[PDB]
Design a protein around this ligand. Structure first.
Ligand SMILES: O=c1ccn([C@@H]2O[C@H](COP(=O)(O)OP(=O)(O)O[C@H]3O[C@H](CO)[C@@H](O)[C@H](O)[C@H]3O)[C@@H](O)[C@H]2O)c(=O)[nH]1
Ligand SMILES: [Mg+2]
Length: 483
């Protein structure tokens, strides 16, 4: 009904493949935007810094029991960790000896069920890539989650067609047609919830809040103070943000614009702050200077998000059965491996962008303890190290000796970008980093078995025709060590 041939070709392919209609409506609206020149770019000049938020450490009151019992926890688990050379779910990586992201995730759920709300609802948003392996893991390790995996745990994200940059038609790939489809980013959570009927089912069952976080962030759990704050302040969507550090490069920051409140009765001048998310992908590429300036944009989205479910549901129903999140136009080739395969756009959205979709939306500053991202092998190095400790409620948080500062880890991306390269680097043990402010690894190198790094430490191999192996027991303090 009024679409371009290319947009109609997408609808047809999606209907043929039995893609849920909410996903088709959502995708097509993005497609229309893209056909009018939209890229998701948010230039510097269109936004301003946010310089005032409440902090969670300013709160004390915990929510009532009804509210608590009404809260569902969901962990995102649909991505690929392709920058870490992973082909399966990142959450199946080991984080501490013999314990994976999924283990700590399951243990957190069990803790909450033993001490807070015995029937706390727990979900995982999976994709076709991660579903099987996740389900398999829970069957072996956490039978009580496996038993209700299909019925209540797993939410399956949609897949949407990759579209040719040429014409915006759906891309075909005869050698492997599965590569014609892509996951639409974690912003798809709202569309998959709504289109599957699970959102309405949850609201029917008496659930009122959902707390979502990234599968790679084991600092995130429900804080009953946030829920009491959302109840008091009548907030329908809340983003947790952390004060941004130099390591916060892959993700998004909070920003504002100013709008002008209803009408002009009383005075024209008065205006309201509107909040939004800018992902790295949304910064104009020749202006990453805007994005990477941690002073200017110092509130980094953790992706720990709180949503009031009935409000989400009514907002989507009243907007054509979709949530109109800003499209992010990702550029790839249809076989991302093969740069001789046709160039495509992959239309995606980020779930934190939903802060722009509700009148009551806000953000709160949380301590770093709620944010332990693992986007790279360098992050994983810190996480596995004694810089991070396991709390009684099964979060991974910095040791108190760190003073809330994660070690900065700068690993050579020729050798350690891929999980195969990283794992060779820590073959003989993971170095103590609890007292390291900054470790930098240059050229090919291998840690020894006793290592302890204190202060600022560069390990530089200029040779790397030959691996620079660190002696066991070695101690490096404010020093460059080289062969
Ligand atoms: O289609 C997708 C893509 C991602 N994921 C999952 O979503 C989570 C976040 O994805 P990831 O690629 O690791 O992060 P980004 O999307 O780059 O960044 C998100 O997380 C950052 C904090 O780490 C925030 O700063 C950004 O705003 C936020 O969008 C991970 O569990 C992924 O597995 C899905 O489930 N489906
Ligand atoms: Mg991902």
């Amino acid at each position: 009904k009024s679409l371009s041939a290319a947009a109609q070709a997408c609808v047809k392919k999606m209907r043929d493949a039995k893609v849920n209609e909410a996903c088709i409506r959502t995708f097509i609206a993005q497609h229309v935007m893209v056909s009018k020149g939209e890229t998701g770019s948010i230039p510097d000049s269109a936004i301003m810094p946010v310089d005032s938020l409440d902090a969670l450490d300013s709160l004390t009151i915990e929510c009532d029991n009804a509210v608590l019992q009404s809260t569902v926890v969901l962990k995102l688990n649909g991505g690929l960790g392709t920058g870490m050379g992973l082909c399966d779910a990142k959450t199946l990586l080991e984080v501490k000896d013999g314990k994976t992201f999924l283990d700590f995730t399951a243990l957190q759920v069990q803790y909450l069920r033993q001490h807070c709300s015995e029937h706390l609802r727990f979900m995982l948003m999976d994709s076709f890539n991660t579903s099987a392996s996740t389900k398999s893991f829970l069957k072996a390790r956490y039978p009580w989650l496996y038993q209700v995996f299909d019925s209540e745990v797993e939410l399956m994200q949609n897949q949407v067609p990759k579209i040719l940059q040429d014409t915006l038609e759906p891309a075909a790939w005869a050698e492997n047609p599965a590569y014609e489809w892509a996951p639409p980013g974690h912003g798809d959570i709202y569309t998959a919830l709504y289109g599957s009927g699970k959102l309405q089912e949850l609201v029917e069952q008496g659930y009122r809040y959902m707390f979502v976080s990234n599968g790679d962030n084991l600092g995130a759990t429900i804080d009953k103070r946030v829920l009491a704050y959302m109840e008091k302040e009548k907030i329908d969507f809340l983003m947790e943000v952390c004060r941004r550090t130099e390591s916060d490069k892959k993700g998004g920051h909070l920003a504002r614009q100013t709008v002008y409140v209803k009408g002009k009765d009383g005075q024209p001048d008065a205006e309201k702050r509107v909040l939004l998310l800018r992902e790295s992908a949304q910064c104009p590429k020749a202006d990453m200077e805007s994005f990477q300036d941690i002073n200017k944009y110092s509130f980094f989205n953790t992706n720990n998000l709180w949503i009031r479910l009935p409000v989400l549901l009514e907002t989507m129903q009243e907007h054509g059965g979709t949530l109109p999140l800003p499209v992010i136009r990702n550029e790839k080739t249809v076989d991302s491996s093969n740069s001789a395969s046709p160039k495509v756009y992959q239309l995606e959205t980020a779930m934190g962008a939903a802060i722009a979709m509700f009148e009551s939306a806000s953000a709160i500053v949380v301590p770093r303890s709620r944010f332990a991202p693992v986007k790279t092998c360098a992050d994983l190095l810190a996480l596995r190290s004694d810089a991070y400790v396991v709390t009684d409620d099964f979060r991974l948080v910095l040791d108190d000796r760190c003073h809330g500062h994660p070690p900065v880890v700068d690993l050579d991306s020729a050798h350690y970008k891929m999980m195969n390269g990283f794992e060779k680097l820590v073959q003989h043990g993971v170095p103590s980093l609890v007292e390291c402010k900054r470790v930098t690894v240059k050229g090919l190198v291998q840690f020894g078995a006793g290592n302890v790094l204190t202060g600022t430490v560069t390990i530089e191999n200029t040779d790397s025709a030959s691996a620079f192996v660190i002696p066991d027991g070695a101690k490096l303090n404010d020093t460059t060590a080289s062969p």
